[PDB]
Amino acid sequence: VLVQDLLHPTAASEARKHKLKTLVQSPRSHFLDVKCPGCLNITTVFSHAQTAVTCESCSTVLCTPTGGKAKLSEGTSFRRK
Amino acid sequence: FRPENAIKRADELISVGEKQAALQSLHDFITARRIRWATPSTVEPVVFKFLEIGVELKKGKLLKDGLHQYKKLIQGSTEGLVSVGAVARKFIDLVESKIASEQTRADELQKQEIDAITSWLRFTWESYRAVLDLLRNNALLEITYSGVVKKTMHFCLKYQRKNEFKRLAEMLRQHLDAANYQQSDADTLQRYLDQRFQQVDVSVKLELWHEAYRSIEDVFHLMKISKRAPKPSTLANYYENLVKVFFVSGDPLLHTTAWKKFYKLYSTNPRATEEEFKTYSSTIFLSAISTQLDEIPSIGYDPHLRMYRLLNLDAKPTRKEMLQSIIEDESIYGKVDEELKELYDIIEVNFDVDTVKQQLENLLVKLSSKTYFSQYIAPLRDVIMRRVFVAASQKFTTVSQSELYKLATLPAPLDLSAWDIEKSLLQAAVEDYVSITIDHESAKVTFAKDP
Amino acid sequence: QQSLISTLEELLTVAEKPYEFIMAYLTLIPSRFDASANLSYQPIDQWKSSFNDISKLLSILDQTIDTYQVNEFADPIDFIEDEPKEDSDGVKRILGSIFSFVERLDDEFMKSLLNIDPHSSDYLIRLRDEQSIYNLILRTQLYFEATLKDEHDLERALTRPFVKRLDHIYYKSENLIKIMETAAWNIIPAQFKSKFTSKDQLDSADYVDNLIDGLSTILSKQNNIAVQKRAILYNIYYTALNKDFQTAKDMLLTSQVQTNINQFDSSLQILFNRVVVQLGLSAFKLCLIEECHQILNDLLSSSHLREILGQQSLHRISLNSSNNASADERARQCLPYHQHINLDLIDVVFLTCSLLIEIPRMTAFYSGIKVKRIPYSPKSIRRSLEHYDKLSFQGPPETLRDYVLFAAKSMQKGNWRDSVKYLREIKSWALLPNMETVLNSLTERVQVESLKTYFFSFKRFYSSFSVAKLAELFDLPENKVVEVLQSVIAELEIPAKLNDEKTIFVVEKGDEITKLEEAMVKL
RNA sequence: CUCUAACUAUAAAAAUCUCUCUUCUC
RNA sequence: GGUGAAAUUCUUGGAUUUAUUGAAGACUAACUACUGCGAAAGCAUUUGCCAAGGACGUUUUCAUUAAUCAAGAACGAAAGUUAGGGGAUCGAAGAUGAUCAGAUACCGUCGUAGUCUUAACCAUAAACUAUGCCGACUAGGGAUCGGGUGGUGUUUUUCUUAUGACCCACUCGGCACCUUACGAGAAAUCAAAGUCUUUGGGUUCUGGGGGGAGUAUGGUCGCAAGGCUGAAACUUAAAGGAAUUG
Ligand SMILES: [Mg+2]
Ligand SMILES: [Mg+2]
Ligand SMILES: [Mg+2]
Ligand SMILES: [Mg+2]
Ligand SMILES: [Mg+2]
Ligand SMILES: [Mg+2]
Ligand SMILES: [Mg+2]
Ligand SMILES: [Mg+2]
Ligand SMILES: [Mg+2]
Ligand SMILES: [Mg+2]
Ligand SMILES: [Mg+2]
Ligand SMILES: [Mg+2]
Ligand SMILES: [Mg+2]
Ligand SMILES: [Mg+2]
Ligand SMILES: [Mg+2]
Ligand SMILES: [Zn+2]
């Protein structure tokens, strides 16, 4: 300490800190393209989804409410994007 | 707690219906911390009940876990280690009795088929493997490994599986590596050696040729690395098995040397009969004659040099040197029957084909008068045939085929076809002793090597 | 869950109306499945009870056909609806249920059979229950073909039972498939609505192939392409099993389904693997050596034949990788024991192919001729021969590979009797549907390849050797010998005086040293 | 470079107090 | 019984104990901690219902809606006052038997109102962390509570995944803690009681030596107890704070 570069924190240190405390207030969340085990369609979901997201194709609720991220349904496949 | 109350509660759990509760309860008794403080030898029969319901159940890895914890509770002195070794030998005996029970169920099932045992065999074999892996790096266990080895060896005898031997051998190899990894018992090495002898004895007890030879090569490595010379009592049949291997495995000189060693081991045992000595000497002598000549330095590296690492020798002699060494010996040479010696003197020195074949007609049926000619015919027959080839090459070059066809035609117990004659000559030429020109316009053969 | 299941059974007993029965089952059967959804395999008696009350559901609907969902005047139900509230139509949002029950049963059954010992009697009784599963598949197909009327909706809701009719039929012979169909149609005394009218005649032989080809034809019309590739692979499966190999090769060339298969899930690749090895085996049945050589040069080029084909237990797969996530993945794609094709047969077929293609050519390579032999076939028999040449043991055979290598070494030496004796000793040939003719063709081809390798081996120490005597001692027609010799002389142009009026060679000219001397004299 | 076991068992009553307070500078 | 010792008091109508039961109201032991909730008072058997709240998560929504706040309001320990209900325990008053010079006090026994409730007054407490609230910054260390993060983590076990419980590295918020001064203080001490003579973040409310005295008087709320508001005449050189040595 006593000499840093607040412009250029270590990226490991940068993600180490909490959001809202970084250099730029960035979100930790992300968006996942999830496919149901039944239908091959792609449905986008917010990572910390609040409501019980349902695929409009079929009543195959993919993610259940939780304090943190919604829990998936054991059969779907998610892609980070 | 108390072993008797533990047996009572396991019995109660037998009664109500849940045997896994009996298994868990017996695990609780054996694996408790107080077994570390209390004397493990006094509390033996809880482990026995653990064994009984484990045989009733299908949980062999939990058996391993309970046994390993019961070792871990007593790791200072020998009393508790002998106690756990006894309970382990009892476990091996009881699961072998279970294997016999599965065998009789299989026999009844076969009779019903006329009128999955593999599951229980896999379970019991994995129990054997868990027992073996558990008992590594521990020193004072001595009779324990002997009992486990004997009953596991019975297990390998009863059923035929070749992959089980591979698994067992590689796991013993890793165990010896671990034993080297954690080096006051000088009987451990001999214990592994005796396990190997039992492996060989059973592997040759039933329809195997490579399993026993692999165990035998490991036995040779164990002798040479270690100090003590194995038991002559078991080494006799061990070299009998080793001879059983050398029938088509390759070099016949190793067969001759090993059969000489069997003769040497049979020279002092209480069961000694002199006509058996005559027959054994005759067998050795005919096998030695059957050995194929090797007088030419090969091209590059013949990969038949790794075999002589089985009979303590490295230098490469020829067949003539080996038979001269046999002549130099006493035990063999004073007991060979005289007719075989006569036929030998006919074969090598002054091998004139006409007189050799005539004396073969004289002495081959008499050579079959005693039950010894059936041992080695094919390589000896090929030797006499190659001898006909080489003598014909020496004698004359310009000649037609049919003269060779009838001058190479052999008596009843060593005879072959005409195409067999030609093919043998061809492959003796492939060895590149003397090249030949074989024309068929008038069916002529001419031996042409420019001197 | 168990108390809720018992409560729903109690309410079913208390219930009286068929619609109430169906709603209670719709609330109960998935509750039971969820109570048995975490397990690998379900209790046999409980799973059979679920099967039985699912069949009860289907039978009660058969008693209440098209009435519990009132007619097209109002396709959604009309009378009491406020209580369950889940009534929007009667087309697919409620009808799309029973096949889901059937397929959940089928998935649990497949996981169970992969998790059961194939050699046990419980596996066989589970196969006897699989018979009933297929009968339920047929009953559900009948009911669903009865329900939906519009051809688009009928196709979308009835191509899946066509896939099911494929999935549990394609492997067995036509006779047992006919027996299965007849038994299923007997188990249903009354219901009859089908696109294909099977009940009318069960006395012909070109009927199972016709039915499966009709299934594929009807399946090819819907939008889903992966299902269409699945159907064409099943057509290849059936044809290479029963019909012939020429038709399978022709429709393979017609469909060209090769480039869209790996981008998709692993089941498509698994079925491709099985059908390709099956067609290679069938081509070997019809005596197509080089053809199945070209065929099996895809799966056996790589070292692994366990994952790619999918034929395996779980202990033998739990040691290659040591993580839990793939222990449920490296084993989920496992294949039923009532579907397996012997790995021993595949291996011995490929090894025989290598023996028949390589050993004469490798002899010609060693003799000194280098004009044609460019390639190096991956994982051939030459590498096994070299590895055997690298070791200290040269004794009796141990496995199928050892027997094949010893047949190859007898092939190289100059005889053919030891190779055919080992092939007859090779006991991986007990599963050939055609025994006598393929064995005779293999014997004749062993003879001819031995004669060719003898032509290659000895032309230097010989100046003249017989040809008809070789034919008599090698059991080959003399004209066939001379035709093979002309083929060899075309392939290599060996310097040798060959004649038929003489049957005697004049060979002593020179293999390659004279040609190099000639080229050096040239310039 | 391996750890978390001991322990005791007392009380009654006793209030009050007259002065006299005085420097640090070498 | 009861005590330091004793007496009062109950007891052959058999007290004390020994068992079963049953009644009443009481409280919720041990779990119980430098741990949790709430604005503070305060809150501890179980279960259901009723509504509520903090913190955390949020690529959700509005866009200054914010802070403290005279005036006004709601809660507000215990005791107290009405009235009705209950009435065990324990105990102001009283009755007692001791101690002592006296003891109508402390110890000892009985015993009224209260102690518990149901609606209404009372609004005071050392209602204390004797530290007003909202902000930003500043030093090292650990655990702990609530949430959420990532583990090729461990046992779990239901074969295996799923949970749960743990281990690690976190992070946000909460009660706190330890070490230190390089800051303060007069010090005791404080991680705020620092960022204050190098004196300015926004804000309410209090004090000007001690007594007289929270007393006099007038209001004001209360039935009453009393609470809030609130002096002066006059009297003194101290009272007081922290530490040092005896
Ligand atoms: Mg006085
Ligand atoms: Mg009494
Ligand atoms: Mg409690
Ligand atoms: Mg708590
Ligand atoms: Mg106010
Ligand atoms: Mg009160
Ligand atoms: Mg008194
Ligand atoms: Mg009093
Ligand atoms: Mg009192
Ligand atoms: Mg009292
Ligand atoms: Mg006050
Ligand atoms: Mg004042
Ligand atoms: Mg005052
Ligand atoms: Mg007043
Ligand atoms: Mg003071
Ligand atoms: Zn879906």
Automatic annotation (TrEMBL), chain A:
<keyword id="KW-0689">Ribosomal protein</keyword>
<dbReference type="GO" id="GO:0000462">
    <property type="term" value="P:maturation of SSU-rRNA from tricistronic rRNA transcript (SSU-rRNA, 5.8S rRNA, LSU-rRNA)"/>
</dbReference>
<feature type="binding site">
    <location>
        <position position="60"/>
    </location>
    <ligand>
        <name>Zn(2+) 7</name>
    </ligand>
</feature>
<feature type="binding site">
    <location>
        <position position="55"/>
    </location>
    <ligand>
        <name>Zn(2+) 4</name>
    </ligand>
</feature>
<feature type="binding site">
    <location>
        <position position="55"/>
    </location>
    <ligand>
        <name>Zn(2+) 3</name>
    </ligand>
</feature>
<dbReference type="GO" id="GO:0000028">
    <property type="term" value="P:ribosomal small subunit assembly"/>
</dbReference>
<feature type="binding site">
    <location>
        <position position="36"/>
    </location>
    <ligand>
        <name>Zn(2+) 2</name>
    </ligand>
</feature>
<feature type="binding site">
    <location>
        <position position="58"/>
    </location>
    <ligand>
        <name>Zn(2+) 2</name>
    </ligand>
</feature>
<feature type="binding site">
    <location>
        <position position="57"/>
    </location>
    <ligand>
        <name>Zn(2+) 5</name>
    </ligand>
</feature>
<feature type="binding site">
    <location>
        <position position="58"/>
    </location>
    <ligand>
        <name>Zn(2+) 3</name>
    </ligand>
</feature>
<feature type="binding site">
    <location>
        <position position="58"/>
    </location>
    <ligand>
        <name>Zn(2+) 4</name>
    </ligand>
</feature>
<feature type="binding site">
    <location>
        <position position="39"/>
    </location>
    <ligand>
        <name>Zn(2+) 3</name>
    </ligand>
</feature>
<keyword id="KW-0863">Zinc-finger</keyword>
<feature type="binding site">
    <location>
        <position position="58"/>
    </location>
    <ligand>
        <name>Zn(2+) 6</name>
    </ligand>
</feature>
<dbReference type="GO" id="GO:0008270">
    <property type="term" value="F:zinc ion binding"/>
</dbReference>
<dbReference type="InterPro" id="IPR000592">
    <property type="entry name" value="Ribosomal_eS27"/>
</dbReference>
<feature type="binding site">
    <location>
        <position position="60"/>
    </location>
    <ligand>
        <name>Zn(2+) 2</name>
    </ligand>
</feature>
<feature type="binding site">
    <location>
        <position position="56"/>
    </location>
    <ligand>
        <name>Zn(2+) 5</name>
    </ligand>
</feature>
<keyword id="KW-0687">Ribonucleoprotein</keyword>
<dbReference type="GO" id="GO:0022627">
    <property type="term" value="C:cytosolic small ribosomal subunit"/>
</dbReference>
<protein>
    <recommendedName>
        <fullName>40S ribosomal protein S27</fullName>
    </recommendedName>
</protein>
<feature type="binding site">
    <location>
        <position position="58"/>
    </location>
    <ligand>
        <name>Zn(2+) 1</name>
    </ligand>
</feature>
<dbReference type="GO" id="GO:0006412">
    <property type="term" value="P:translation"/>
</dbReference>
<dbReference type="Pfam" id="PF01667">
    <property type="entry name" value="Ribosomal_S27e"/>
</dbReference>
<comment type="similarity">
    <text>Belongs to the eukaryotic ribosomal protein eS27 family.</text>
</comment>
<dbReference type="InterPro" id="IPR011332">
    <property type="entry name" value="Ribosomal_zn-bd"/>
</dbReference>
<feature type="binding site">
    <location>
        <position position="36"/>
    </location>
    <ligand>
        <name>Zn(2+) 1</name>
    </ligand>
</feature>
<dbReference type="GO" id="GO:0003735">
    <property type="term" value="F:structural constituent of ribosome"/>
</dbReference>
<keyword id="KW-0862">Zinc</keyword>
<dbReference type="InterPro" id="IPR023407">
    <property type="entry name" value="Ribosomal_eS27_Zn-bd_dom_sf"/>
</dbReference>
<keyword id="KW-0479">Metal-binding</keyword>
<feature type="binding site">
    <location>
        <position position="57"/>
    </location>
    <ligand>
        <name>Zn(2+) 3</name>
    </ligand>
</feature>
